[PDB]
Design a protein around this ligand. Structure first.
Ligand SMILES: *[C@@H]1O[C@H](CO)[C@@H](O)[C@H](O)[C@H]1NC(C)=O
Lengths: 48, 49
């Protein structure tokens, strides 16, 4: 949002095999990032 | 292309080494990140202010 980058995080336990569970939970804000650069796409990073 | 500065304490004003620092800055291409202190005062209660 206007250069500000905002990430909202939520830690929660779960016991299910593969799919998204059913229930209600909210994501509290974690930290706001004043980056100020444009973004067109993204890519994830893994541990080898 | 380079000549070496030679400074001695015997030099007068102008010939002495004058350390110079310039603080150049960029204008509003992003959210503001660097600036001065916003002063804060003591807290008061039980009176409209
Ligand atoms: C990102 O790219 C768009 C594409 O036109 C441009 O309008 C925008 O100014 C760019 N962002 C920055 C921070 O330069």
């Amino acid at each position: 949002i206007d250069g500000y980058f905002k990430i909202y995080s939520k830690h929660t336990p779960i016991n299910l095999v593969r799919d998204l569970p059913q229930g209600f939970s909210a994501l509290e804000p974690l930290v706001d990032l004043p980056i100020g650069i444009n973004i067109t796409r993204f890519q994830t990073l893994l541990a080898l | 292309p380079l000549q070496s500065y030679g400074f001695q304490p015997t030099y007068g004003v102008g010939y002495q080494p004058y350390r110079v620092v310039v603080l150049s800055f960029e204008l509003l291409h992003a959210p503001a990140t660097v600036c001065g202190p916003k002063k804060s005062t003591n807290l008061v209660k039980n009176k409209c202010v």
